[PDB]
Amino acid sequence: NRPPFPWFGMDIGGTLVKLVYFEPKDITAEEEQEEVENLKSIRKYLTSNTAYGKTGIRDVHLELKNLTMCGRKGNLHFIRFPSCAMHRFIQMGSEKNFSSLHTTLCATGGGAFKFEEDFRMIADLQLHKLDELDCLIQGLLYVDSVGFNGKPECYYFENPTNPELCQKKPYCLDNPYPMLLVNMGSGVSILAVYSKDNYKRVTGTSLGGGTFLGLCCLLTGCETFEEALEMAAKGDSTNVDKLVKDIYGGDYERFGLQGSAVASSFGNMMSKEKRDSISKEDLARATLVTITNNIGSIARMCALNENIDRVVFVGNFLRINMVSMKLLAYAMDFWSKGQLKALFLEHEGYFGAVGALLELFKM
Amino acid sequence: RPPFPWFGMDIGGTLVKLVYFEPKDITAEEEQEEVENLKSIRKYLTSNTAYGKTGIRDVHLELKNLTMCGRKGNLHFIRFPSCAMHRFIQMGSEKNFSSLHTTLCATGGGAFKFEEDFRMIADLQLHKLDELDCLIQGLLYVDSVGFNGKPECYYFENPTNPELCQKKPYCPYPMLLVNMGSGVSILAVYSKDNYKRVTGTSLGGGTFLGLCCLLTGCETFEEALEMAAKGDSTNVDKLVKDIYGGDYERFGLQGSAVASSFGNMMSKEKRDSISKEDLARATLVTITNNIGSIARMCALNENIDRVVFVGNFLRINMVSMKLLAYAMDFWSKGQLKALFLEHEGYFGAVGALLELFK
Ligand SMILES: CC(=O)SCCNC(=O)CCNC(=O)[C@H](O)C(C)(C)COP(=O)(O)OP(=O)(O)OC[C@H]1O[C@@H](n2cnc3c(N)ncnc32)[C@H](O)[C@@H]1OP(=O)(O)O
Ligand SMILES: CC(=O)SCCNC(=O)CCNC(=O)[C@H](O)C(C)(C)COP(=O)(O)OP(=O)(O)OC[C@H]1O[C@@H](n2cnc3c(N)ncnc32)[C@H](O)[C@@H]1OP(=O)(O)O
Ligand SMILES: [As]
Ligand SMILES: [As]
Ligand SMILES: [As]
Ligand SMILES: [As]
Ligand SMILES: [As]
Ligand SMILES: [Cl-]
Ligand SMILES: [Cl-]
Ligand SMILES: [Cl-]
Ligand SMILES: [Cl-]
Ligand SMILES: [Cl-]
């Protein structure tokens, strides 16, 4: 009972859309004959272009080559466009008569509901909405099972906080189970994954990327995450936080605490004098450090409680650059006394769309 | 047997705590053989609840029918503000305390400030003791004797529902002790001679005050907590129900759970209409919910099922305590209670008194 081509999955965000497409490479002479024109041209449209209209982009470097999907050999392609271009996408769906190939389209993402009726009225498609976390996890595990063209899908950072020594290093453990997934959007969900068909949300924290943005907008008068990060990257949090060395003069060995460990986040801001001279850049950085250090702590304690040694970090909170990621890397190493690393994934951001595609094969 | 009277002191930045063991088994002959200086100090302490201008004996906290170094009697809890300290030392000199003891056991971060005045004005040497050691010994001692046949320990039931909220009692080792100052340190206490700091968080009272001041223009703990008491955090935080239109059924996460602390403040429109009290309350709820989670996880890591909260962050307004109670309740799915202690504030003084016998 194999679903017919073409095979797509989508992740429709509030601001960003991701689309994944499987290109079959093993199409028989018999199949090529019975295939309708509509399909033939979408397939050639997808594979001969890497830019689609004003905003569509195929990330060629992410292409997974020579894999198996539902018993067929081919390649997986990763495409992106902003949500504002979505009306044009749905209009493309109508012009290319997509409904003649499929009545439905699998999609996850917080933006999906916004567009469900447009899909029906403009393209005569049913958007079949899926859970973000189930899609993420299924997509992640699939991409990890097939590998990144013989290279590792996973990576970590060595000496993250020292830009003189910081280095992305691959992590080639073939068997990822069990693992802990730390999903950081506006809030944070932490899932133990024991197998493809066996996982559960163990806990989470409300102190996430939206706390970071909410607090910076309030504290610094910025409006976007990009602004918040740009300030958080030039800042010095030690002006805002009271450190152990400020209380004890150095380490406090009795408590196993080094001088550079934070005693109280925002502790300097209890003084009116210090508040009146603090920089917008320092407040932003302090906000980011507080949140990343706290996520590292909670991730470490969960890893211990669940007896899991692999902690994988994904989510919106990690996009734009690597400031977030390197601070989480530092935090994980701190709380774990060097015994756990923060692990990250090359295909981060596309896992939802891959999990949506995979829904096609559930029967 | 050390001679009477038996005192312990904890001298803090704003409050001084004093505990006093009143012996209730004085013989007719002991009474005949006791110097006048002692007899009148005992009469003074026991016949008064107001001492000088600012001194208060808190009769509610009194422990009756204790035995202490083999004498039957009562322990009394007394306090006065630090600015009355000059008057207290003069009182010791006028009442000739040095004729009874040459030294006095004291802890607290102002035992150093006043050591010189004690020596010069009252001819008394302060024997200064470590704050943490005194806290632990006192806490453990008070828990071991109980509160007049009732538990020293209590929790709140239905903490955030004022119509339902009930302070209920809880009837030992090991326990986790969450000590909240400017930061939070968590200690595993296995017995009275063994405790170790197991972990903590830099997100505590200090973060609450610093963030409140920055967000609202307030300046003090008392002011931040009064605002946080009046505000509504749900205007500031994004709740699970905001995202899913109710519970997130897939993972059984309640609609009322907070999804993203300060998450509504990502919206310019929402920022322009928020009250400062709502921000204050969101700041507190964020900090306490988080402390709740770290404490719960630490209990799990340690296989310890008893979690006690103490520290100056609890004293100023009871709002902190109710939120911690709700948090522990939430993270443990009702399996762990936030435990609080009736004699909180005085444990250091009790620990100091106990040193008199070692
Ligand atoms: C007692 C207590 O409550 S203790 C606290 C306990 N709370 C918990 O354990 C829950 C912790 N939080 C979580 O687990 C997570 O936040 C979840 C699972 C609830 C939600 O997951 P998140 O990753 O935070 O959701 P996400 O960031 O995607 O937000 C959802 C959607 O809201 C919308 N959204 C995102 N940002 C904004 C914004 N700035 N403004 C308006 N809407 C937005 C988007 O459509 C987003 O979808 P998208 O990211 O696909 O584009
Ligand atoms: C990567 C990262 O950094 S993640 C963050 C990791 N950080 C942590 O885990 C630490 C979290 N914080 C904590 O555990 C606590 O804040 C501590 C233990 C550091 C400090 O204890 P707090 O209860 O917050 O004390 P607070 O900061 O309120 O005041 C410090 C007290 O220590 C006292 N002190 C100073 N030196 C000493 C000493 N040598 N011996 C005993 N006490 C001392 C100070 O005088 C002060 O006393 P006071 O209140 O009487 O004036
Ligand atoms: As299949
Ligand atoms: As991995
Ligand atoms: As004794
Ligand atoms: As107890
Ligand atoms: As109550
Ligand atoms: Cl497959
Ligand atoms: Cl679950
Ligand atoms: Cl993803
Ligand atoms: Cl005090
Ligand atoms: Cl105390």
Coordinates of N, CA, C and O and ligand atoms in Angstrom, one line a residue, chain A residues 11 136 314-315 319 347-353, ligand 10:
Chain A
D11 N 6.8 22.1 7.2 CA 6.8 22.7 8.5 C 6.6 24.2 8.4 O 7.4 25.0 7.9
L136 N 9.3 16.4 14.8 CA 10.7 16.7 15.1 C 11.5 15.4 15.5 O 12.6 15.2 14.9
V314 N 18.3 21.2 20.2 CA 17.6 21.7 18.9 C 16.7 22.8 19.2 O 16.3 23.0 20.4
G315 N 16.3 23.5 18.2 CA 15.2 24.5 18.3 C 15.5 25.9 17.8 O 16.7 26.2 17.6
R319 N 19.1 29.6 16.3 CA 19.3 30.0 15.0 C 19.9 31.4 14.9 O 20.1 32.1 15.9
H347 N 21.2 19.2 10.4 CA 19.9 19.4 9.7 C 18.9 20.1 10.6 O 17.7 20.1 10.3
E348 N 19.4 20.7 11.7 CA 18.5 21.4 12.6 C 17.6 22.4 11.8 O 18.1 23.2 11.0
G349 N 16.4 22.4 12.1 CA 15.4 23.3 11.6 C 14.5 22.6 10.5 O 13.4 23.1 10.2
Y350 N 15.0 21.5 10.0 CA 14.3 20.8 8.9 C 13.6 19.5 9.4 O 13.0 18.8 8.7
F351 N 13.9 19.2 10.7 CA 13.4 17.9 11.2 C 11.8 17.8 11.2 O 11.3 16.7 11.0
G352 N 11.1 18.9 11.5 CA 9.7 18.9 11.4 C 9.2 18.5 10.1 O 8.3 17.6 10.0
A353 N 9.7 19.1 9.0 CA 9.3 18.8 7.7 C 9.6 17.4 7.3 O 8.8 16.8 6.5
Ligands
CL10 CL 13.7 21.1 13.1

